[PDB]
RNA sequence: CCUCCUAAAGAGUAACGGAGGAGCACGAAGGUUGGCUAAUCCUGGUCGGACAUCAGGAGGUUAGUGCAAUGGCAUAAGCCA
RNA sequence: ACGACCAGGGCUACACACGUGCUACAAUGGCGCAUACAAAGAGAAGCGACCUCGCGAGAGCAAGCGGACCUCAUAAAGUGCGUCGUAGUCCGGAUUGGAGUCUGCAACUCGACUCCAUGAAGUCGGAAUCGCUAGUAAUCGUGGAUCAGAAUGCCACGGUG
């Protein structure tokens, strides 16, 4: 986990994008690769297509998702079952 | 000898006896005892009722037993609802904290299941 | 008897105020409280049933009836007239006393108690509930008991509607939800 | 009720941590000492705090401050 | 040997006609006095589940009869003491 | 393009089978307080005393020192006193929840460490099978390389024996 004195980590570009979206009021999914980026309060309401390594999967941001990071909601490997 | 809605063994030392409560380990018990003014080595038997009451009060300060359990459940349920990686792991019944699964995950997985 | 006395003066009055009843006899009253221990494990050995009965007696000052199989069923491996459960029906002052105990002591002693089911009324007034542990009653000693067991409480009342019954119970400061 | 088949049933005093004194008829025999009662039990006080759902946004605000 | 149908509304009535049972049981499952009323379903209820035990309603003998079938049976011939 | 650059993912998946290890299953022990005796090493984009703050991991301040000088760095098993009294326990620590620290552009996948909570399996292990003849086996700690960080591995060092 991130050190508290350092503050939370968000990619600059992604932050800028988020800000732009907020300014607009638009509801089009934003395709991003920044899985390591922490979700913010201002990020709520937006859909953001997080890259899973192969494809971009849309994540509708909720109140409970805030403290979390973006990669958590974008499962990377696909396992069904052995038999 | 009932603290936080559960019966507690009398013959055991106070520190260890408190540990019978879901919500307190050793350190917590020690802290409780300090708050009370009661010695660690003394048994639950041969205590004054006032002392016991004080101990109960001290226990009440921490989230213990059923209350704690419910909270724990909620967190898990919350995670499940989220559908985050940890939540996903929980729903599967496999190690959350990034442990290996190829071998040695038998605490989560239970006993070995033969291939049909 | 304290609770009966309370009912006589206050609860009835409250009920009248609420439902706007014409007759004082139209008011609901708790007819009987029925306690039951279903004990399937008795078919293996007789003593367990006896123990259960003793526990029941300790809980409620009456000696229990030992109920028997109405019909034989293979699914549970029992024959007709097999001593399978034990039951106490409480009426009058003793019943009132039991009720007093239940709410003022026993229910409070329930481990992880966050209320009683409000939607548990049969549809015609008569409330029912069940306890997982017999040790919630201060009558049973924690050290003495060998087998953990429980019982079902059934509060039968004169109430025509379930809502009325609920109201009555509330008037007796019944925990609910 | 029947004379001999029934267990002994006599009035006892049930003391508590509240200071509440409760004279009740019971099969216990000896004087009873309680931990909690109906008046004491944290139903009205506890159950508001005991759920503790809260929110994440506020938590985030608290610890980072931007 | 018993029950039903064949059997034609008294009785009886045949066929290598159509269907089923008996070769017992019970010192209470007999006598009597006193009391009681079933199947099944729905709802609620610790473990407890389609199905034990407890409530309450619907239900109205659809149950029961020591066993085949028929005729009976609440005045119960059914179930307790 | 079977060449080159980039971001994200994977090499860490998980019905299962095998190998090599670590930790245990306790009392020749656990826990608590006190207290003794090493060796061998490393260190400048490094080792970092003291003092202050932090339950703690650590943080702040900041000497020293390319080092028989200073630092890592308190050896641990042990010894003495106390406690537990054979229990799935004051054994055992897996797992999970919450709160954190540090490294690093960055710890979701996927780090280590700390605190509080949680307390699985396991009561010496079937057929079978391995190592070791002396300062050896067994057991106890310590250091180094690789390294921003990340060892139960490896290579070393001493203790008891
Ligand atoms: Mg004729
Ligand atoms: Mg004729
Ligand atoms: Mg008669
Ligand atoms: Mg007769
Ligand atoms: Mg590999
Ligand atoms: Mg194996
Ligand atoms: Mg076990
Ligand atoms: Mg290193
Ligand atoms: Zn009280």
Cβ-proximal residues to D33 (8 Å cutoff; 6+ apart), any chain: B49, D14, D15, D16
Other Cβ atoms less than 10 A from the Cβ of B38: the count is 19
Q: Which residue has the tokens 């919350």?
A: B78
Tell me if A43 sits within 8 A of A18, measured CB to CB.
Answer: yes
Question: What does the alpha-carbon distance between residue A30 and residue C50 come to, in Å, rounded to a whole number?
Answer: 71
- Cβ C112–B70 below 8 Å, yes or no? yes
Q: Which residues of A touch B86 (CB under 8 A)?
A: 72
If phi over 0 gives left and psi between -120 and 50 gives alpha, with beta otherwise, what is residue A56?
Answer: beta
Task: Give a three-class secondary structure readout of chain B.
Answer: CEECCEECCCCCEHHHHHCCCCCCCHHHHHHHHHHHCCCCCCECCCCCHHHHHHHHHHHHCCCCHHHHHHHHHHHHHHHHHHCCHHHHHHHHCCCCCCCCCCCCCHHHHCCCCCCC
A38: DSSP letter: B
Tell me if B51 sits within 8 A of B36, measured CB to CB.
Answer: yes
Question: What does the alpha-carbon distance between residue C67 and residue A30 come to, in Å, rounded to a whole number?
Answer: 70
Cβ-proximal residues to B112 (8 Å cutoff; 6+ apart), any chain: B106
Q: Which residues of D touch B67 (CB under 8 A)?
A: 46, 50
The structure's method of determination equals cryo-EM
State the Cα angle at B52 between D13 and C101, rounded to 5°.
30
Question: What does the alpha-carbon distance between residue C136 and residue C53 come to, in Å, rounded to a whole number?
Answer: 17
Question: What does the alpha-carbon distance between residue A39 and residue B22 come to, in Å, rounded to a whole number?
Answer: 34
Name the 3-class secondary structure at C7: helix
Q: What domains lie within chain C, and their CATH numbers?
A: 1-177 (3.30.1440.10)
Letter string b/e over residues B58-97, b meaning 16 or more CB atoms within 10 A of that residue's CB: bbeebebbbbbebeeeeeeeebeebebbbbbbbeeeeeee
Residues of B with CB under 8 A from a CB of D: 2-3, 49, 53, 56, 67, 70-71, 74
Question: What does the alpha-carbon distance between residue A68 and residue A29 come to, in Å, rounded to a whole number?
Answer: 19
Burial class (CB in 10 A: 0-12, 13-18, 19+), B41: exposed
Pick A67's closest partner by Cβ from D56, D65, D66.
D56
Provide the Cα torsion C78, C80, C85, C88; round to 10°: 170
Q: Which chains sit next to A, with 3 or more Cβ pairs under 8 A? A: B, D
Cβ of residue C34 near strand E, that is under 7 Å? yes
For chain D, what percentages of helix, strand and coil (3-state, to nearest 5) are there? Answer: 25, 20, 60
Sign of CA dihedral A16, A18, A21, A23: negative
Q: Which residues of A touch D62 (CB under 8 A)?
A: none
Question: What does the alpha-carbon distance between residue C144 and residue C97 come to, in Å, rounded to a whole number?
Answer: 24
What are the structure tokens assigned to C60, written together? 């409620």
Q: What is the resolution of this structure in A?
A: 3.2
Name the 3-class secondary structure at D33: strand
Nearest nucleotide to A69, CA against C1' atoms: F108
Measured in Å, residue B95 CA sits from the centre of ligand 5 at 19
Question: What does the alpha-carbon distance between residue C165 and residue C173 come to, in Å, rounded to a whole number?
Answer: 13
Name the 3-class secondary structure at D4: coil
Other Cβ atoms less than 10 A from the Cβ of D18: the count is 14
What are the structure tokens assigned to C16, written together? 């009248």
Sheet holding C83-90, edge to edge: C65-68, C83-90, C30-38, C151-157, C127-131
Q: Where are the domains of chain A?
A: 2-82
């Amino acid at each position: 986990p991130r050190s508290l004195k350092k503050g939370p980590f968000i990619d600059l570009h992604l932050l800028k994008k988020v800000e732009k979206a907020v300014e607009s009021g638009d509801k089009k999914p934003l395709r991003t690769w920044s899985r390591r980026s922490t979700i913010f309060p201002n990020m709520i309401g937006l859909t953001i297509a997080v890259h899973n390594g192969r494809q971009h999967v849309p994540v509708f941001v909720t109140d409970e998702m805030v403290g979390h990071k973006l990669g958590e909601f974008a499962p990377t490997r696909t396992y069904r079952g052995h038999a | 000898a009932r603290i936080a809605g559960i019966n507690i063994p009398d013959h055991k030392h106070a520190v260890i006896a408190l540990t019978s409560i879901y919500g307190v380990g050793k350190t917590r018990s020690k802290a409780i005892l300090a708050a009370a003014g009661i010695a660690e080595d003394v048994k639950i038997s041969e205590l004054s009722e006032g002392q016991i009451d004080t101990l109960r009060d001290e226990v009440a300060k921490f989230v213990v037993e059923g209350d704690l359990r419910r909270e724990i459940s909620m967190s898990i349920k919350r995670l499940m609802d989220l559908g985050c990686y940890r939540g996903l792991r929980h729903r599967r019944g496999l190690p959350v904290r990034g442990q290996r699964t190829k071998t040695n995950a038998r605490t989560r997985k239970g006993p070995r299941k033969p291939i049909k | 008897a304290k609770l009966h006395d309370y009912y006589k003066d206050e609860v009835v009055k409250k009920l009248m105020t609420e439902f706007n009843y014409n007759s004082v006899m139209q008011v609901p009253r708790v007819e009987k409280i029925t306690l039951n221990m279903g004990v399937g494990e008795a078919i293996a050995d007789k003593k367990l049933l006896d123990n259960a009965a003793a526990d029941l007696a300790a809980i409620s000052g009456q000696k229990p009836l030992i109920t028997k199989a109405r019909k034989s069923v293979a699914g549970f491996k029992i024959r007709q007239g097999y001593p399978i459960g034990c039951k106490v029906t409480l009426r009058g002052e003793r019943m009132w006393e039991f009720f007093e105990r239940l709410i003022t002591i026993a229910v409070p002693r329930i481990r992880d108690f966050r209320g009683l089911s409000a939607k548990s009324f049969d549809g015609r007034g008569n409330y029912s509930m069940g306890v997982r542990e017999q040790i919630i009653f201060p009558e049973i000693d924690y050290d003495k008991v060998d087998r953990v067991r429980g019982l079902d409480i059934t509060i039968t009342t004169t109430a025509k509607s379930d809502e009325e019954g609920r109201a009555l119970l509330a008037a007796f400061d019944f925990p609910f939800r | 009720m029947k004379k001999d088949i029934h267990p002994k049933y006599e009035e006892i005093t049930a003391s508590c941590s509240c200071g509440n004194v409760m004279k009740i008829r019971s099969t216990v025999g000896h004087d009873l000492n309680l931990d909690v009662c109906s008046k004491c039990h944290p139903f009205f006080t506890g159950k508001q705090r005991d759920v503790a759902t809260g929110g994440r946004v506020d938590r985030f605000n608290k610890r980072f401050n931007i």
